[PDB]
């Protein structure tokens, strides 16, 4: 039995930690909903 618990409001936060790069990747999506890298 799965259950849910509240974790917070959905809002933009000014001066939040900024991180992460922006890669451009060639991908394929299969009938099972799985992404794979195409090379």
């Amino acid at each position: 039995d799965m259950y849910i618990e509240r974790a917070g409001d959905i809002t933009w936060e000014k001066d939040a930690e900024v991180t992460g790069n922006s890669p451009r990747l060639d991908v394929a999506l299969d009938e099972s909903g799985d992404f794979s890298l195409v090379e």
């Binding site: 799965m2 849910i4 959905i10 933009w12 930690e17 992460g20 922006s22 890298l37």
Partner: protein
């Protein structure tokens, strides 16, 4: 049960103790999450029940109590925030510039942030606080890191 708009943890007591299997968004009386989190199973909210309403394994999305309500989209230029809800840890916003998943059917935004598998379903927001998609379905790249698509449904 609780129907107030917001981000929610998805938990189970089947395994050892209480385990967080994913995350979801409550908006307009509808609960939105990724298909791989619940497998389409019913959910409990206190003493109330949430029954599945729509779902699709290929999109990896599911809605409870009503049709999919989230219809905002990434503009293709601006930074976004992942409102990450990791297991056992406080909700935390992380700002990032999304990359791109290029497919035979078009391009999709992608976020290159590393989090445990139980963080799947955490919402990605634009500067107006609108949910532009959910985090949790993507790929593993050369450096072992995870890159998730910005997965969004369609509002009928």
């Amino acid at each position: 049960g609780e129907t107030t708009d917001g981000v929610y943890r998805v938990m189970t007591r089947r395994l050892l103790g209480s385990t967080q299997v994913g995350v979801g968004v409550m908006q307009e009386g509808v609960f939105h999450t990724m298909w791989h989190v619940t497998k389409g199973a019913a959910l409990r909210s206190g003493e109330g029940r949430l029954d599945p309403y729509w779902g699709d394994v290929k999109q990896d999305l599911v809605s409870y109590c009503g049709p999919w309500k989230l219809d905002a989209a990434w503009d293709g230029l601006s930074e976004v925030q992942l409102l990450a809800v990791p297991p056992g840890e406080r909700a935390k916003n992380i700002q990032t510039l999304p990359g791109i998943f290029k497919t035979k059917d078009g391009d999709i935004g992608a976020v290159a942030l590393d989090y445990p598998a139980g963080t799947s379903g955490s919402p990605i927001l634009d500067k107006c606080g609108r949910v532009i998609g959910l985090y949790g379905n993507g790929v593993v790249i050369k450096n072992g890191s995870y890159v998730s698509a910005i997965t969004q449904g369609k509002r009928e």
